[PDB]
Amino acid sequence: PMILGFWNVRGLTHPIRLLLEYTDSSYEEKRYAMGDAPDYDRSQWLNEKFKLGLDFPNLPYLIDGSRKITQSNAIMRYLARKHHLCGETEEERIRADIVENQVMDNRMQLIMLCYNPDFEKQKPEFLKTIPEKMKLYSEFLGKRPWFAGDKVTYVDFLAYDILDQYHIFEPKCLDAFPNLKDFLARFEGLKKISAYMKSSRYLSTPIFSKLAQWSNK
Amino acid sequence: PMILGFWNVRGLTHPIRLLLEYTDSSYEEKRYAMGDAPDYDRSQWLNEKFKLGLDFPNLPYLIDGSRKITQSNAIMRYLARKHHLCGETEEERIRADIVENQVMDNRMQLIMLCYNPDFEKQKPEFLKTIPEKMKLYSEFLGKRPWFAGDKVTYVDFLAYDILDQYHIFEPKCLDAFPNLKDFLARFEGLKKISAYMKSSRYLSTPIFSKLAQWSNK
Ligand SMILES: N[C@@H](CCC(=O)N[C@@H](CS)C(=O)NCC(=O)O)C(=O)O
Ligand SMILES: N[C@@H](CCC(=O)N[C@@H](CS)C(=O)NCC(=O)O)C(=O)O
């Protein structure tokens, strides 16, 4: 089976665990544990960071035979390439490309907040940026069932995760935006996703490493 | 023509400018100026940000007729599909995806270090690191002319940029890596690239605004 490796958290891998499922892929996972404060020992990982034959060692990684892939979007795209969950017209590919990048910006802005010792006094400003972020996703999807058109793509898996995360962080943030709730619900409503969500393998929280100020435990 | 918008800095747009040149695109640019200290003004940009009909307003942007793109990465992939500068086998596509993503990570690490608090009382420490990032590119490439193998692909413009910056901030950083040195020289050597670096359009520095630390004048 393929081997996915990642920390014992959701992090940036939720989209990959979900695609592995959706596709009825044969895989096993390696979930590395980190230590508690004040030092956050990472040896579990570091004892093999340099021994997997990875080009640019990092977490997450995928191994399917000989092929060894790092960078979450590159894992994401290899799988989609495999399963045909990519754009099929220029129009689909543009929409996919943008959304893939936009998620990461928004995923990054979140981390930057959750990883700062100033969280508490910083939160109140970040919170005012939210409506605006949500509004873009809302206007972008419009009346489309999925982010790139009338077909599910690997970008819906990326979008679902970031929209979910922001939702956990501010429960009310999708209230003014019904096509997004409609979005979230339709994603879940999927056969293998529903099934996965009630399995022993489902990992929704913590979001972040014990190092974060939020969703760290 | 096509319009490229961005700040009047290098930022993360170097590869786009270079690709537009190489492809003999018909384009003009709008090089937004940032006011300065204290309040470094962005009025030039903010006044039309939500007026151009961009889904996800940001710098940089590409308008090519009816197509309006945002996200530096999506701009590249778009230009790469338009002119047939994509990998042609699974193996090439995989090498492209990873490289594409790796650059942004290296690209962001560098900025993290330049706009921050005690850029100096942390100076060395992340410098002593270049050398070991370099080895990774080095080994990844090996003896291939180009990063996805046989042919020049869009990722090459992105590899070029990052290796070019690391080089500014570490004049020797490459001493150990012939193949990297050979790469730079043979990039700087493509016919339209040559010509462009001699032109009035060319902008090698500053890399990031007044504000910053490094490449900020
Ligand atoms: N660009 C990367 C970021 C990867 C990354 O930062 N991985 C983290 C946690 S999310 C890590 O700790 N990597 C292991 C390491 O640095 O040794 C991605 O999209 O995969
Ligand atoms: N991931 C985005 C980065 C974009 C971004 O951070 N843009 C900065 C300059 S490097 C900006 O000033 N953007 C315009 C804005 O935020 O309104 C990209 O790859 O295009």
Swiss-Prot record, chains A, B:
Glutathione binds at residues 6-7, 42-45, 49, 58-59, 71-72. The modification Phosphoserine is found at residues 66, 204, 209. Pfam families: GST_C (PF00043), GST_N (PF02798). Residues 89-207 form the GST C-terminal domain. GO terms for biological process: cellular detoxification of nitrogen compound; cellular response to xenobiotic stimulus; glutathione derivative biosynthetic process; glutathione metabolic process; hepoxilin biosynthetic process; nitrobenzene metabolic process; prostaglandin metabolic process; response to amino acid. Substrate binds at residue 115. The keyword RNA-binding does not apply. GO terms for cellular component: cytoplasm; cytosol; extracellular region; mitochondrion; protein-containing complex. It is found in: Cytoplasm. Residues 1-87 form the GST N-terminal domain. InterPro entries: Glutathione-S-Trfase_C-like, Glutathione-S-Trfase_C_sf, Glutathione_S-Trfase_N, GST_C, GST_mu, GST_superfamily, Thioredoxin-like_sf. Its EC number is 2.5.1.18. Its main location: cytoplasm. It comes from the Eukaryota. Keywords: Cytoplasm, Lipid metabolism, Olfaction, Phosphoprotein, Sensory transduction, Transferase. One of its GO terms (molecular function) is protein homodimerization activity. It catalyses: RX + glutathione = an S-substituted glutathione + a halide anion + H(+); prostaglandin A2 + glutathione = prostaglandin A2-S-(R)-glutathione; prostaglandin J2 + glutathione = prostaglandin J2-S-(R)-glutathione; prostaglandin J2 + glutathione = prostaglandin J2-S-(S)-glutathione. Belongs to the GST superfamily. Mu family. Yb subclass selectively binds steroid hormones. Homodimer or heterodimer. Conjugation of reduced glutathione to a wide number of exogenous and endogenous hydrophobic electrophiles. The olfactory GST may be crucial for the acuity of the olfactory process. Participates in the formation of novel hepoxilin regioisomers. This is Glutathione S-transferase Mu 1. It comes from Rattus norvegicus. The gene is Gstm1.
